[PDB]
Scaffold this active site. Structure first.
Site, short mmCIF file in Angstrom:
data_model
loop_
_atom_site.label_atom_id
_atom_site.label_comp_id
_atom_site.label_asym_id
_atom_site.label_seq_id
_atom_site.Cartn_x
_atom_site.Cartn_y
_atom_site.Cartn_z
N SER A 114 -66.35 11.91 -72.10
CA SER A 114 -66.51 10.48 -72.73
C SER A 114 -65.38 9.40 -72.45
O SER A 114 -65.54 8.29 -72.44
CB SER A 114 -66.96 10.72 -73.99
OG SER A 114 -68.26 11.32 -74.23
N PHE A 115 -64.16 10.07 -72.78
CA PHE A 115 -62.89 9.42 -72.86
C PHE A 115 -61.92 9.67 -71.71
O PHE A 115 -61.04 9.46 -71.54
CB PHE A 115 -62.06 9.75 -74.19
CG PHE A 115 -62.79 9.86 -75.23
CD1 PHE A 115 -63.24 8.60 -76.11
CD2 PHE A 115 -63.49 10.94 -75.72
CE1 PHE A 115 -63.80 8.75 -77.29
CE2 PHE A 115 -64.18 10.88 -77.01
CZ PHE A 115 -64.43 9.75 -77.77
N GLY A 116 -62.78 10.27 -70.74
CA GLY A 116 -61.95 10.76 -69.56
C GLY A 116 -60.74 11.60 -69.71
O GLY A 116 -59.88 11.61 -68.78
N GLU A 117 -60.85 12.48 -70.61
CA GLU A 117 -59.83 13.20 -71.22
C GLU A 117 -59.83 14.59 -70.71
O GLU A 117 -58.78 15.49 -71.09
CB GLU A 117 -59.97 13.23 -72.97
CG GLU A 117 -61.17 14.20 -73.39
CD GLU A 117 -62.41 13.62 -73.41
OE1 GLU A 117 -62.81 12.64 -72.51
OE2 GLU A 117 -63.49 14.06 -73.96
N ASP B 239 -72.28 18.11 -82.22
CA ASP B 239 -72.36 16.92 -81.26
C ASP B 239 -73.25 17.64 -80.10
O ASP B 239 -72.45 17.69 -79.13
CB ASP B 239 -71.08 16.27 -80.85
CG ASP B 239 -71.55 14.96 -80.03
OD1 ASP B 239 -72.48 14.55 -80.27
OD2 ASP B 239 -70.23 14.21 -79.59
N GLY C 186 -60.89 11.64 -64.13
CA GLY C 186 -61.18 12.18 -65.68
C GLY C 186 -62.69 12.23 -65.87
O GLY C 186 -63.48 11.35 -65.79
N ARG C 187 -63.17 13.36 -66.60
CA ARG C 187 -64.50 13.68 -66.99
C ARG C 187 -64.36 13.50 -68.43
O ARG C 187 -63.32 13.87 -68.85
CB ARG C 187 -64.71 15.00 -66.45
CG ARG C 187 -65.15 14.91 -65.02
CD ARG C 187 -65.72 16.49 -64.51
NE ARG C 187 -66.21 16.48 -63.05
CZ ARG C 187 -65.49 16.46 -62.08
NH1 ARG C 187 -64.07 16.35 -62.16
NH2 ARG C 187 -66.16 16.70 -60.89
N1 LIG Z 1 -64.86 23.27 -68.97
C1 LIG Z 1 -65.38 22.14 -67.80
O1 LIG Z 1 -65.18 22.51 -67.01
C2 LIG Z 1 -65.61 20.94 -68.47
C3 LIG Z 1 -65.62 20.28 -69.74
C4 LIG Z 1 -66.01 18.94 -69.63
C5 LIG Z 1 -66.25 18.64 -68.40
N2 LIG Z 1 -66.14 19.72 -67.57
C6 LIG Z 1 -66.45 20.01 -66.22
C7 LIG Z 1 -65.04 19.52 -65.32
C8 LIG Z 1 -63.99 19.20 -66.00
C9 LIG Z 1 -62.75 18.85 -65.31
C10 LIG Z 1 -62.65 18.94 -63.76
C11 LIG Z 1 -64.06 19.24 -63.15
C12 LIG Z 1 -65.06 19.54 -63.77
CL1 LIG Z 1 -66.54 20.12 -62.99
#
Ligand SMILES: NC(=O)c1cccn1Cc1ccccc1Cl
Length: 323
Positions: free
Chosen positions: A65-68, A170, A62-63
């Protein structure tokens, strides 16, 4: 007059369609329905359901702030993209009404949105370089030339949003995302976004990152497109220093100090070239009337880049120790 009927045709299904229909539908979001803007994300008999028609990459990671935010795949087409989960009860209609229909290489494309139960699932292009925020942590902080290069591209995305009376809400490294080689940056996440006029603390309001809040936000004064510009320069200081403004000096309730204290121009590094320092200063003026617009600062920043010999550092060079 037919508006009412178009909205009803959209409810209760997921369909291939256009941005104007996604927006229409999304306005109703204060079982499984939505609109998909690319033929690569395709419904199947009126439905598009997590773990049936699309699968998040495994194991779950999960990426955001909220791993969302997750990598996902459409089970039929094999197409990969990113999905951002938003909880239905706190969904802001502006998140889809703002970006729906936008087209700009400085803004991450929206690919669709599907409601399924207590989730709104927002799909978008997957950018493999990750967030600027995760570049900063990985590299410690960034060279002056790279920081200028990225600020300028953020500012280009903001010109485009501001021209159409949209406030991002933001702006910060975490919401700028990088192409795989690092040369393209693009604004992401319209969760705090807002449709403008040429007050702020009322209604469906989700505030931005505290450390990047402008004073007119904090004191509840009238706000405008200029609040993004303050943020963008807080982000600049973050790229340069490896930390957010204010965090080093004040410890308790930060938003009080943004109001009373002078703007944080002391955090401009002294080894920064003259015009870099001056550009950041004009984006950090406490009254919006004296602060640079996106267009004014983008221009200033682009000449600031020129003035230090252009972009020359490698993208993932060597680790710079922060402040
Ligand atoms: N639009 C995106 O890719 C995004 C939005 C927020 C972070 N990211 C990167 C990201 C999200 C999910 C999986 C892998 C990655 Cl490198």
């Amino acid at each position: 007059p037919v508006e009412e009927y178009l909205v009803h045709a959209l409810q209760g299904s997921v369909s291939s369609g256009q941005a104007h229909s996604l927006a229409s539908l999304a306005k109703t979001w204060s079982d499984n329905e939505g609109v998909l803007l690319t033929e690569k994300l395709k419904p199947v008999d009126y439905e598009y359901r997590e773990e049936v028609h699309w699968m998040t990459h495994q194991p779950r990671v999960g990426r955001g702030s909220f791993g969302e935010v997750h990598r996902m795949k459409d089970k039929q087409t094999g197409f990969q993209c990113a999905v951002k989960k938003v909880r239905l009860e706190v969904f802001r209609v502006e998140e889809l009404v703002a970006c729906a229909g936008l087209s700009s290489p400085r803004i991450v494309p929206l690919y669709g949105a599907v409601r399924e139960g207590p989730w709104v699932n927002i799909f978008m292009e997957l950018l493999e370089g990750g967030s600027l925020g995760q570049l900063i942590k990985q590299m410690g902080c960034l060279p002056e030339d790279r920081a200028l290069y990225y600020l300028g591209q953020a500012l280009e995305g903001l010109e485009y949003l501001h021209t159409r009376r949209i406030l991002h809400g933001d702006v910060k490294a975490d919401n700028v995302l990088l192409s795989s080689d690092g040369s393209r940056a693009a604004l992401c996440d319209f969760g705090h976004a807002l449709c403008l006029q040429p007050s702020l603390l009322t209604g469906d309001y989700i505030p931005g990152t505290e450390t990047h809040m402008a004073p007119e936000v904090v004191m509840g004064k009238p706000c405008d497109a200029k609040v993004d510009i303050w943020s963008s320069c807080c982000m600049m200081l973050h790229m340069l220093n490896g930390c957010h403004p204010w965090t080093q000096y004040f410890r308790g309730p930060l938003c009080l100090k943004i109001a009373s204290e002078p703007p944080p121009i002391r955090e401009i590094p002294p080894s920064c070239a003259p015009l870099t320092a001056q550009a950041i200063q004009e984006g950090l003026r406490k009254e919006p009337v004296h602060r640079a617009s996106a267009m004014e600062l983008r221009r200033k920043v682009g000449k600031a880049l020129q003035e230090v010999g252009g972009l020359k550092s490698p993208w993932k060079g060597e680790y710079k120790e922060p402040r």
